[PDB]
Amino acid sequence: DLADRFAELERRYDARLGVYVPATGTTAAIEYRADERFAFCSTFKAPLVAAVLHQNPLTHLDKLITYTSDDIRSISPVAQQHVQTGMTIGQLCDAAIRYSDGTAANLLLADLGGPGGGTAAFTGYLRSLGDTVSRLDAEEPELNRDPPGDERDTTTPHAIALVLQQLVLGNALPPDKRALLTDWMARNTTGAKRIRAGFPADWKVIDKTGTGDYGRANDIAVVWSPTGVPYVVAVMSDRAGGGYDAEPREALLAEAATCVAGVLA
Ligand SMILES: *C(=O)[C@@H]([C@@H]1N=C(C(=O)O)[C@@H](S[C@@H]2CN[C@H](CNS(N)(=O)=O)C2)[C@@H]1C)[C@@H](C)O
């Protein structure tokens, strides 16, 4: 039983686990705590890049953005190397997705603009995709820090899976912008030990990860079978029982994905 297995994993890792795979032709939806709120963490960067792509001509990607010392306030493996020179919007999108750069996300939020440093417009984008659940309230690093239970900066496995489905598989973006978003997620460097680890090598995996305080570890993916059948997989977890400093546990997501992969194979 799938639900029994997910509950076992929760006891093993002293964690709360959320899983959603939308229904397809012949497979029913997989759901475990799928309508419970979990912090976005860095998973919001996937729809953020889509929002920025949608809002502008494609050659906005070539616009240079400048920033400084006081702009580096969170984990930013790329933006710290380029503070002296600046980064184009395209470079910022690449870094936000592939390295989960926090400063890049902040700069992209500012580019989208409006109240709350871009967070209201970000939420507005999700609303336009029929998501009435998710909300973004703060930027990096505050968005990862809300107490367990707090609804600020949250999505649900269910809501984020439906958003990602429209972005990658549906027609939320035109084909050329859709391909840019897909390729970046395909070239993600942070996801090897999460959903990727649960699926056989001949299945294609594209993803965006999230990690935060209270043992928070997320992964949202689109996967393709060897025969080109796509599936959207959302896995979210936290470990509130360990407090603010609870270690995130990638292995939980890898195990949960393995259980998902077994059903879809
Ligand atoms: C988003 O959730 C934050 C940012 N994103 C992360 C992610 O995994 O999505 C990390 S980035 C980086 C990848 N793992 C590194 C830790 N090294 S370790 N412990 O050996 O795996 C961190 C980071 C939290 C947010 C800052 O934007």
Q: What is the CATH number of the domain that holds 30?
A: 3.40.710.10
CB neighbours (10 Å) of residue 24?
13
CA dist 34 and 235 (Å) reads 9
Radius of gyration of the chain from Cα atoms?
A: 17
43 in contact with ligand 1, CB cutoff 6 A: no
Is 64 strand, coil or helix? Answer: strand
Say if strands 204-212 and 216-224 run parallel, antiparallel, or are unpaired. Answer: antiparallel
Say if strands 154-155 and 38-39 run parallel, antiparallel, or are unpaired. Answer: antiparallel
* CA-proximal residue: ligand 1, atom 15 (nearest): 190
> What are the start-end ranges of the E strands in the chain?
16-21, 30-32, 38-39, 64-65, 87-88, 154-155, 204-212, 216-224, 230-238
> In Å, what resolution does this model reach?
2.2
Experimental determination approach used: X-ray
Q: What is the DSSP letter of 247?
A: P
CA dist 68 and 80 (Å) reads 9
Catalytic residue among 139, 140, 250, 255: 140
CA dist 168 and 186 (Å) reads 11
Q: Which residues of 64-81 are buried (b: 16+ CB within 10 A; e: fewer)?
A: ebebeeeebebbbbbbee
Sign of the C-alpha dihedral computed for residues 192, 194, 196 and 200 taken in this order:
positive
Task: Locate 236 and state its tokens.
Answer: 């979210």
In total, how many domains does the chain have?
1
140 in contact with ligand 1, CB cutoff 6 A: yes
CA dist 87 and 64 (Å) reads 6
Nearest to 2 by CA among 263, 185, 183, 255: 263
75 in contact with ligand 1, CB cutoff 6 A: yes
191 in contact with ligand 1, CB cutoff 6 A: no
CA dist 78 and 150 (Å) reads 31
CA dist 211 and 88 (Å) reads 25
- Bridge partners for 218 per DSSP: 210, 236
CA dist 76 and 101 (Å) reads 4
Omega before 115 cis (within 30°)? Answer: no
Q: Which residues of 228-260 are buried (b: 16+ CB within 10 A; e: fewer)?
A: eeebbbbbbbbbbebeeebebbbebbbbbbebb
Which region, left, alpha or beta, applies to residue 33 given φ > 0 means left and ψ of -120 to 50 means alpha?
left
- Bridge partners for 154 per DSSP: 39
Quote the domain boundaries for residue 154: 1-265
Closest ligand 1 atom, CA of 141? 26
103 a known binding residue?
no
CA dist 244 and 138 (Å) reads 18
Catalytic residue flag (residue 69): no
Catalytic residue flag (residue 140): yes
Nearest to 162 by CA among 256, 59, 31, 52: 31
Is 22 strand, coil or helix? Answer: coil
Q: What is the DSSP letter of 153?
A: T
Number of Cα atoms under 13 Å in the Cβ half of residue 110: 13
Q: Which phi and psi (to 5°) does residue 72 adopt?
A: -100, 100
Q: Is 157 exposed, middle or buried (0-12, 13-18, 19+ CB in 10 A)?
A: buried
Closest ligand 1 atom, CA of 41? 2
100 a known binding residue?
yes
Contact 108, 121 (CB under 8 A): no
Which region, left, alpha or beta, applies to residue 149 given φ > 0 means left and ψ of -120 to 50 means alpha?
left
- Written as one letter, the residue type at 85 is T
Is 144 strand, coil or helix? Answer: helix
Residues present in the chain in total: 265
CA dist 154 and 38 (Å) reads 5
Which CA distances in Å does 174 have to 55, 72, 150?
12, 33, 35
Q: Could you tell me which residues come within 8 angstroms of residue 253 by beta carbon, excluding any fewer than 6 positions away?
A: 193, 194, 195, 197, 198, 217, 218, 219, 235, 237
